[PDB]
Design a binder for this molecule. Structure first.
Ligand SMILES: [Zn+2]
Lengths: 245, 81, 217, 62, 124, 102, 52, 88, 96
């Protein structure tokens, strides 16, 4: 009678409604570490969202980032919860790090959700409340996602554009795989052409297209050449590819 | 007025992880895995059969301020091999 | 969970700032070809990422060896560095750190008569860096032992407070040799960390990434 | 005279533990304090000219 | 707490014109930073007691091990030889010059903190 | 008296720092007065860039060191920037330093 | 002055520096001394108001 | 006007009520943060060097112990006592 | 009397104000203060060696003697190069 008793006890004491009842105390921690383990269920994440929705305004930056990354990984959008998340980020924008704000903005970009105050506070936090070399440690895909977030929302901050443009490099684009570097370069050039902002570091982006032009389409090469001509006129010179020397 | 009294309020303090350094050095000294510097593990029959004075050996008990260099505190076992 | 409060301008903070900035200045960063601006800033940050932490490592070894060396000059205490395995373990660890860094640069596996000769003289750095510290900490101590033995032998046999000029000369020589031991202690810690910088900095060279595309004029 | 220890590995591990503690205490307790105190002064000295010029431009008092 | 300049602005705006000039020493005293007064002088801390008890414990253990050694009197006079140079270091070292030389090793204390000038931050 | 609080707070804070730095100023008072500067210096220490001003001294990069100092104190102007952006937003305008061609 | 503020610092209350003075290493310049005097005259805010 | 809310967490005056606690560095807060962010990726060369020295000195201790065992067995087989007499 | 505060003040006034170079008038005999520090160093070493030898003087020396002997012992345990011989002779000497 070990089999039936053990089997009956295990299902009753081990199924997914009671391990949602262990996760009511610390919803950011548990939702993050369960979504990173592949457990992404809408049925559990609705209970996560309404369990954490009064707790959001007092959450730290680590817990807000963990919650926001978890709810990207589940792909469950709650309007009220993410409005609370955005109010938490807007209230404590000086305490957030660029490493966390890129992950938050990627989730706020995944489904469309934005405020003028949220975009202003994220831009103020990345430009003035964080280190100016924090986009260098970021990875070019996250900076491209933040750039297209600000491009799709139409919100233009030239100081944030300079700060995030500093993160684009031969190093950061070289860390990316080629299929990822294609999307990163195309989205970053589209954002830079939308804003009309052409910094020096766009040479690292356009060059990352023109060093390997075989992966790009003819249409994408045409849009890259348009951005190259505009950046040539804005920076007052001619774009050269530099070999080893 | 200065912050001198505020720093005089704080007492002496050890460096922040000195307990880990002491607990590393002590754990290296006590987890040798070998007997303790002039001892030998013996059988339990020998250890209970042997008196306390025969278990002690005179080289491990040197005299504190010896009038002759080589004076030992105990004489060890009177039984000699 | 509560960190202590620190006074700005404290003497340990100032001394340790000067020591760290001294050991950091041993292997300076290479000046790039381009003017350093926001275009070259990620390449500069990446070049700092490729560089080893020789300032922190040399400061670590300098502090941990000047402390163990000055322990031998405190009363009732002996130097841990005067033990063989301690000082030679520090030296073999520095050589292994430099070797592991150089192997990580070249791809994690090891490279007529010239190759054996230079490999013997390279592998001798492992012995030499630790043994030149160990026998130097054994140096003034064992000479001090024998000399204070004879300095005891004079008034033990001629009387407790009689013939004071001869024992005065031997105690003057003893005092001069403990002062020389102080100099040798500080100087051996310094020589060890200078050598650690020049051994690890042989493999501290990675190429600058730089801009692969520019807009000239 | 003592030359050879009872254990070479125990003494080398003592050296490794002491130097690893000094490395942790430098990197974690000493260097953050030193860099706060150093980089406040260094950032103010590097930014005095540009900071005073930017604040002079932003000031409407003159 | 709230910042001191906003307290200055509020309490200066709250005074009348007749009350203003004599209140200025009070308002200043409410904007002065807290410099904590000298509190109770306890004896030694439990970490200071642990430190000196462990140092005396170590010195007694080491002296007992030195006396049981073979050339024990040699070690006991080595202790005298080292304590002599500690005593001579107390006499010879110019501690003020050493303090001010250590102040020159760090760039934060080698110079006066030069930053914000008054003329850029004048408010009117 | 429109922006007197920000300018006088800058004056008060730097005056207290300059009076007490290197003599008896606690690190807690420094981290309380300028938490964002301490946050940026802590980012530099965390990301193995504690010798970054030494690195800029090694390369002779005077403009990059001047920019590094100016960007670590860039938050001092952020109260004024946020206040003037809200002033322009209440008037329906766009803030000048926010625009690319502005 | 800077030497006066150094004299009140905790490090000159330490044992090896009880009898030392910060003025003995680098003396204050007369601009520093007259500035300390002029600042002591202006710590009264009413006197500063009347003067300005 | 510019109120307190525009400089709420950005700029503070010297404290008037009490001296606050010191803000900890993330490495002082957590050993895991220091281990994953600085100790491994910057000091793994030192950690491997200490590992190499501990391994090599264990090998040398094994060689010393095997030599002592060989001399002990050679003394036992030759009918000699393996050590000589103590002083007392 | 706080146990450590009075000790600190007494050691401070001994360390700073008390000076045997001035109270015994040693500027007449000696050129410098640093020469007094050097002579006081070697005098402290000599006083320490003599009181450590006087605390126990009948013992057999572990240090090698320069062919000499203390006072009238001559051929006793104190002047025995053989240490086992010196231990057994010390027992007969202790018998009395
Ligand atoms: Zn010794």
């Amino acid at each position: 009678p070990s089999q039936n008793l053990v089997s009956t006890f295990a299902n009753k004491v081990i199924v997914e409604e009671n391990l949602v009842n262990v996760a009511e105390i610390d919803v950011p921690f548990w939702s993050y570490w369960l979504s990173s383990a592949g457990f992404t269920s809408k049925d559990a994440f609705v209970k996560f969202a309404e369990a954490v929705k009064p707790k959001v305004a007092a959450l730290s930056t680590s817990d807000i980032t963990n919650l926001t990354v978890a709810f990207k990984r589940a792909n469950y959008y709650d309007k009220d919860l993410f409005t609370g998340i955005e109010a938490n980020v807007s209230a404590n924008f000086t305490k957030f790090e660029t490493e966390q704000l890129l992950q938050i903005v990627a989730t706020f970009d995944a489904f469309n959700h934005s405020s003028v105050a949220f975009l202003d506070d994220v831009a103020d936090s990345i430009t003035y409340c964080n280190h100016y070399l924090a986009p260098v440690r970021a990875g070019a895909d996250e900076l491209a996602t933040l750039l297209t977030y600000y491009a799709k929302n139409g919100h233009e901050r030239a100081d944030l554009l300079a700060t995030v443009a500093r993160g684009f490099s031969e190093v950061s684009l070289g860390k990316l795989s080629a299929a990822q570097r294609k999307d990163t370069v195309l989205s970053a050039l589209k954002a830079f052409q939308t804003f009309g902002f052409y910094p020096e570091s766009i040479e690292a982006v356009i060059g990352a297209a023109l060093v390997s032009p075989a992966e790009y389409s003819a249409e994408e090469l045409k849009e890259v050449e348009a951005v190259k001509v505009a950046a040539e006129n804005a920076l007052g010179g001619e774009f050269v590819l530099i070999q080893e020397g | 007025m200065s912050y001198s009294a505020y720093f005089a309020k704080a007492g002496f303090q050890f460096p922040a992880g000195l307990s880990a350094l002491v607990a590393g050095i002590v754990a290296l000294n006590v987890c040798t895995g070998r007997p303790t510097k002039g001892t030998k593990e013996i059988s339990n029959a020998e250890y209970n059969a042997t008196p306390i004075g025969y278990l002690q050996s005179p080289d491990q008990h040197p005299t504190a301020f010896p009038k002759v260099p080589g004076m030992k505190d105990v004489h060890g076992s009177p039984h000699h091999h | 969970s509560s960190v202590r409060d620190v006074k700005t301008g404290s003497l340990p903070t100032n001394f340790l700032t000067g020591v760290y900035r001294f050991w950091r200045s041993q292997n300076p960063a290479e000046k790039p070809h381009d003017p350093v601006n926001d275009r070259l800033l990620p390449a500069v940050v990446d070049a700092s990422d490729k560089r080893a932490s020789i300032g922190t490592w040399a400061t670590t070894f300098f502090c941990t060896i000047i402390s163990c060396n000055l322990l031998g000059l405190m009363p009732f205490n002996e130097a841990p560095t005067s033990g063989l395995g301690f000082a030679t373990g520090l030296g073999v660890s520095v050589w292994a750190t430099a070797t592991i860094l150089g192997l990580s640069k070249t791809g994690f596996k090891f490279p007529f008569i010239f190759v054996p000769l230079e490999t013997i003289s390279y592998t001798f750095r492992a012995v030499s860096l630790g043994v030149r510290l160990w026998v130097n900490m054994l140096a003034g101590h064992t000479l001090l032992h024998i000399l204070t033995g004879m300095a005891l032998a004079l008034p033990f046999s001629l009387g407790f407070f009689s013939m004071v000029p001869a024992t005065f000369g031997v105690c003057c020589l003893l005092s001069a040799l403990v002062g020389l031991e102080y100099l040798v202690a500080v100087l051996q810690s310094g020589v060890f960390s200078i050598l650690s910088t020049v051994y690890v900095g042989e493999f501290n060279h990675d190429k600058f990434i730089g801009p692969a595309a520019k807009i000239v004029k | 005279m003592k030359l050879l220890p009872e254990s070479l590995q125990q003494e080398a591990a003592t050296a490794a533990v002491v130097a690893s503690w000094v490395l942790w205490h430098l990197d974690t307790q000493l260097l953050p304090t030193i860099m706060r105190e150093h980089k406040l002064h260094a950032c103010w000295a590097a930014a005095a000219k540009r900071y005073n010029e930017k604040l002079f431009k932003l000031n409407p008092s003159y | 707490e709230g910042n001191s300049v906003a307290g200055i602005i509020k309490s200066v705006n709250e005074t009348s014109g007749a009350n203003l000039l004599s209140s200025l020493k009070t308002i200043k005293a409410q904007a002065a930073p807290i410099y904590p007064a000298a509190a109770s002088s306890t004896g030694y801390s439990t970490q200071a007691k642990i430190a000196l008890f462990g140092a005396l414990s170590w010195i007694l253990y080491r002296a007992d091990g030195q006396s049981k050694a073979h050339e024990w009197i040699v070690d006991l006079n080595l202790n005298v030889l080292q304590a002599a140079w500690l005593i001579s270091f107390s006499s010879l070292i110019p501690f003020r010059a050493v303090y001010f030389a250590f102040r020159g090793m760090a760039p934060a204390t080698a110079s006066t903190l030069n930053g914000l000038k008054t003329f850029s931050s004048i408010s009117l | 008296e429109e922006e007197e609080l920000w300018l006088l707070t800058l004056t008060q804070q730097f005056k207290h720092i300059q009076k007490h730095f290197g003599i008896d100023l606690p690190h807690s008072v420094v981290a309380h007065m300028d938490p964002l500067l301490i946050k940026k210096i802590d980012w530099e220490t965390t990301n193995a860039l504690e010798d970054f001003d030494i690195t800029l001294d090694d390369m002779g990069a005077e403009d990059a060191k001047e920019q590094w100092g100016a960007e670590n104190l860039s938050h001092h102007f952020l109260p004024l920037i946020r206040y003037r952006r809200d002033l322009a937003r209440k008037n329906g305008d766009r803030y000048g330093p926010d625009l690319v061609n502005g | 002055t800077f030497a006066q503020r150094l004299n009140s610092s905790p490090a000159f209350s330490s044992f090896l520096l009880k009898r030392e003075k910060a003025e003995s290493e680098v003396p204050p310049s007369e601009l520093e001394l007259e500035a300390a005097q002029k600042a002591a005259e202006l710590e009264d805010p009413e006197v500063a108001l009347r003067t300005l | 006007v510019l109120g307190e809310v525009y400089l709420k967490d950005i700029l503070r005056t010297p404290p008037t009520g009490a001296i606050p606690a010191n803000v900890p560095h993330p490495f002082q807060t957590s050993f895991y943060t220091y281990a994953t962010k600085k100790l491994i990726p910057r000091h793994w060369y030192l950690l491997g060097g200490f590992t190499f020295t501990i391994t090599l000195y264990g090998i040398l201790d094994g060689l010393r112990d095997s030599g002592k065992k060989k001399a002990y067995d050679e003394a036992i087989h030759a009918g000699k006592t393996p050590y000589t007499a103590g002083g007392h | 009397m706080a146990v450590t505060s009075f000790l600190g003040k007494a050691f401070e006034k001994y360390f700073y104000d008390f000076s045997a170079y001035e109270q015994f008038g040693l500027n007449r005999f000696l050129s410098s203060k640093g020469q007094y520090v050097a002579l006081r160093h070697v005098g402290f070493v000599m006083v320490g060696v003599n009181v450590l030898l006087a605390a126990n003087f009948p013992f057999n020396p572990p240090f090698p003697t320069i062919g000499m002997c203390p006072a009238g012992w001559e051929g006793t345990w104190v002047c025995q190069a053989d240490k086992a011989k010196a231990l057994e002779m010390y027992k007969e000497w202790k018998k009395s």
